[PDB]
């Protein structure tokens, strides 16, 4: 029906969804296809609204074009962009650090006014990076992402501000174009109304009025009814504006020859022309939607404006007293409100397309200056397009952006969900936004307009709690960047199948209902009073016809990772936040097992993430294998798919793809063919289902720790593969040149026994700290400097990749060769490692118990994991309990006794749930899932085991035994199947030690970091906590002969290894520095005694 | 807010009884750090 | 050492500076791009500020660690360790 | 007399900056997961304003 | 034979009182984690939801003695603010005794 | 004021100098990088500038010239020495080569990090380690 | 002065300390750590050391 290869995953849902989950990463692709005027977006735009659908590049090349010098004689102009075919595929770019891009062309034309000539040729503007089917730009071998960015929308924004001395509310103004005249009107502390242009000294506001060529009569005509007028009208200023304009000017650029024409041109150029005034269509539209200007009229070219500047002062005055509505003499009627900074009708989204557009704009401005110079300096008849173009600035800008900009981020490539959330991530920090000022509680909080646009739960936990969210599922983006969420229209009390993608400026004006508002049939409601939202997020119990719109589903405000947590609504926002943020840092496992009790949003999350290899045209599998697949479509063609086996991600994890098909199997476009790292048949599997008991054991699950069974180490259940990439570079130096050889100065052969006749380890080797991965030699006759495995690493090699300059590879400049070895480790679960379910129930293993000593059901089933009771209630993560019970049911299926009649609790249950087999997946969506009454009578059925017995009660509990004492347990105990995850918080990456290693060379302190064999930091709080005891020799140690004292450390090491008693410190290096730094100021610190 | 949450974590929260429970959560997860900061301030002073 | 009892601070009569120092400074040449070696009798110098690398001269006469404490009559630096470049200041003497 | 107030406010700013530099940082934490911290919610200058 | 009776200090950031630092006698456990008595988890505000710990070795004999005597875990039972014990049964021990 | 200050001296040959101390180089980071690009800071061109001005004076007294310009160059030398000791006491201070001012000896002990507000920020010690923790219930307090 | 020079407007402190030839005697422990010396507390003070 909806998806072909959909393993039967029963649904406890009761409502009917009139909208399928849109393309979960369609925002990135749509924005790009808008940045390159692609044809699909062309048809999209034409089919809806405008019929001249300009792209995003053409807008740049046009707003700039034409171009000419000051003398105007000769001009130039671009047109007709166009794209070539990519030079290399994706994996073909990865395997050699190449880049994914396409040659970009242009069609420029030069002309001369005296000759009236035309030379129009196509130019080449480099290699334009490009987006894949996933949403990731590739940059020099790596897979990258370009996240969105929340910013303010250009347009008037008003805000009352109370003087902290005299508590008198006075309003204000600010016209905030994309660039140009930065400005703010206001009601001054006096009745007068001053301005502040260019963010500078204030002046009257009638001044600027009569500056445009106006008079006091028309002013008092169109507005003379507010006192603030007289205050600023009684200035006794020369009505002929000849100086105050020149005064403003002389304030701008002190030292100018004075002229009325000068100030005239400055005012008409800095506020009313593209030079330094351009309300990008978003801003002109924000100022049109408000004040009701030019209603129902195109918006192409009204950035500059002589009327959008005059109605703003009217808004401000009429808001002073509170005139609750307005109307332009020719426009529409709009209210008089104030403007919030977070309201999404005032914020907007700088999608990737717009960032790239802007960097291209900058590069083209640099090229513009270049050609201005070449054109007012070079002689005519020798300059035509290929000579009037220096592209390097453009390419350099694009690469600078894609390399440095904090928005050009590596792909969070732990698991498909991590990557899929790194896309759709809304980042309110970056070039153009806030970084220092608003890092408080006015942007790090939730707003009622975040309903269907951002998930109030999913947000990183580090420094960016609130500055980084995650776009929701049923959401899209206006061409203008304003986010949109769908809503079902409703009229007279009968719901409809119509759907409108509204934005907050079109929703606060209306009344929206809720999803669960029941409806009998045909579209009619069931009650007379329902629940609704309103303008200021004020929920209400209100009538059934007053409504005007209606939601489209539950889970409309939640993100993806939050729409995968079952029984979420039974949790607390903080623990759901933890769970969301702890599914992203889950490591792929060897065998991915689908979730027994899950949520419907588990298939799309892998179809729409680019880690499953799907078909493209209904057909027949023809040839199968581990690496390659060969389809034979029913159209005549033969599609061939290639699987990436054992590919290191950007975090260390594997990417093993395996096929789920056989030979001859019919398929259907969209039907999965091969799973990914964390998928089973097409649905996201991040961890495993485990038999759970909930009970305090003999002191090993104390304080959030937990227990496991050695079975999870025999059967390789929670086993995970980790891959590491070491490398070196062979280059030149002063003493000659670097080489990569097996010849090693003065060593034994046990070392080299694993290497080959070239210097690199033989694939299939077994290495460890102290093993030569590649033999390099550095001159001076030579130096012993090869590559060696660090402390704590070990495993078997997989790949050796040697890129050589002698064989035409785009290596760096000071380089002759580049060698990259890949090693791998099959790490098992172990003490210290971290685990967590989906409801923030995290914990580090503290024991691993022999199966023979684990509490076992009478059937012998030895429980695997043992949680604790004292962690559920005081945290409000009760959902897991339910996830537990249902799990058991889903494992040992049920058959409701309908022989008599469907019990009252199974009334709302839909058919296909009255019966099920054993080990049967399920789906309990978030806010339309299995309530607590359809579950406290489901456990009853709970089909028995093979021996006919039920190993569970009607409450979810069993009568466990003990493996050590043998005796049973007195009271019944909870038991079930809970889905846990493995995290990247492994001890093998966290343990760190040091006795004597490398130092700073600048402060003479042990270095900091396991990455570089560093030491631990003995801060100030620790100094205090020591002084409090009375320990003065230990502190002397930790400050002198362990950090700074340069001879003490070595004398101490040596005395120790000799058995002697260690000496006392000398003088630290910090004090020495202090003394020989004071002496620099001609202060004589003379010690005494 | 005069619109309370008449539903528990067992009976199951609704949506809008769940979109107003976040505000304070984020507020607190941000306030914790400022609390630690003011504590460190008082402590460094009392030690001075 | 670290038997201290008091730290008397105060001004330094300009002769005290001359006493602190092992030499003066007369060349306003921090470094020369070439030779990867700071200039002579200048800033970041090698005459007052210790032997740069290890018991080393700039001439290249006595790099022999065997000997110790010999200044070079061609370049003027004493072969010592502990990067004495750190505990060595110089007196500028103007008029 | 706008001479003292300058040194007063600057010394208070410096005291609060030292207070912040005194707390542990993310390169030195021993917690579950990187959480929010004093150094990225408020500035020394506001930590001074709010004690006067 | 080179680890017997030689104590080591354990710190957990942040450090908010003299009992945030304590000296223990180390035994050897095949693993990669640092065990810890479950009574001192209050002094440290330490829970095992992925937290960390830092070790420090004393070398001199004065320091070994300061550890053994001033900063040991058994000689440090009471909080120096109220005199009320700080290493006592808290969560599951309490329920068992109850 | 007079009494406190003078009685402080109850010798005052410190308020003026005919000599000056120059720190050692290791405390002034100026190294090289692969390719021919330096790694330099804003505390070492000041001694060079001061030597330049003392040189401009070294050929303006014995060589023979009028007291006017000798004394003006002396004032300039003093204004340049004021950069070695906390340039920032005249409003617009000495500006570095690119755009920003210089870091002077009085900054080492005065401002953001310094050496007095930094010698207590702690250390980074040897003979140490770090790891995650678990629960030993089979363990005695010691 | 070793201690108050760990506080602000230092230059004033150092100046006023130089003229008087102030000679800090190391009685506290906010400064005996700067010097890498034994704080006067616990296994510090003569009475025990
Ligand atoms: Mg914790
Ligand atoms: Zn020599």
Coordinates of C-alpha atoms in Angstrom, one line a residue, chain A residues 734 1001-1004 1036 1047 1065-1069 1071-1073 1075-1076 1078-1089, chain C residues 1-14 16-17 20 22 36 53 81-89:
Chain A
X734 CA 66.5 20.8 4.5
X1001 CA 58.2 23.5 26.0
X1002 CA 56.5 26.9 26.8
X1003 CA 55.3 26.7 30.4
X1004 CA 57.2 23.5 31.2
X1036 CA 54.2 20.9 47.4
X1047 CA 65.3 19.0 37.7
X1065 CA 61.7 20.6 45.6
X1066 CA 63.8 23.5 44.4
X1067 CA 62.1 26.6 42.9
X1068 CA 59.2 26.2 40.4
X1069 CA 59.3 27.7 37.0
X1071 CA 57.8 31.7 40.3
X1072 CA 61.1 32.1 38.4
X1073 CA 59.1 33.5 35.5
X1075 CA 60.5 37.1 39.2
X1076 CA 62.3 37.6 35.9
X1078 CA 58.9 41.7 37.6
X1079 CA 62.6 42.6 37.2
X1080 CA 61.6 43.7 33.6
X1081 CA 59.6 46.5 35.2
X1082 CA 62.7 47.7 37.0
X1083 CA 61.4 46.3 40.3
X1084 CA 64.1 44.5 42.4
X1085 CA 62.6 41.6 44.2
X1086 CA 65.4 40.6 46.6
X1087 CA 64.7 37.5 48.6
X1088 CA 65.8 37.4 52.2
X1089 CA 66.3 34.9 55.1
Chain C
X1 CA 66.6 26.7 49.1
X2 CA 62.9 27.3 49.8
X3 CA 64.1 28.3 53.2
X4 CA 63.0 31.8 52.3
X5 CA 61.5 34.1 55.0
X6 CA 60.8 37.5 53.3
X7 CA 60.6 39.1 49.8
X8 CA 61.8 42.7 50.0
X9 CA 60.7 44.5 46.9
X10 CA 61.7 48.0 45.7
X11 CA 63.1 50.1 42.9
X12 CA 66.3 49.2 41.1
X13 CA 69.0 51.9 40.7
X14 CA 70.0 51.7 37.1
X16 CA 71.5 47.1 39.5
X17 CA 70.2 46.4 36.0
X20 CA 71.7 41.6 36.5
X22 CA 75.5 39.4 31.1
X36 CA 66.9 30.6 10.7
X53 CA 70.3 24.5 21.0
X81 CA 72.3 23.7 29.6
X82 CA 68.8 24.2 31.1
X83 CA 68.0 26.6 28.2
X84 CA 69.7 29.4 30.0
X85 CA 68.1 31.6 27.4
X86 CA 65.3 31.8 30.0
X87 CA 67.3 33.3 32.9
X88 CA 69.3 35.9 31.1
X89 CA 68.4 39.6 30.7

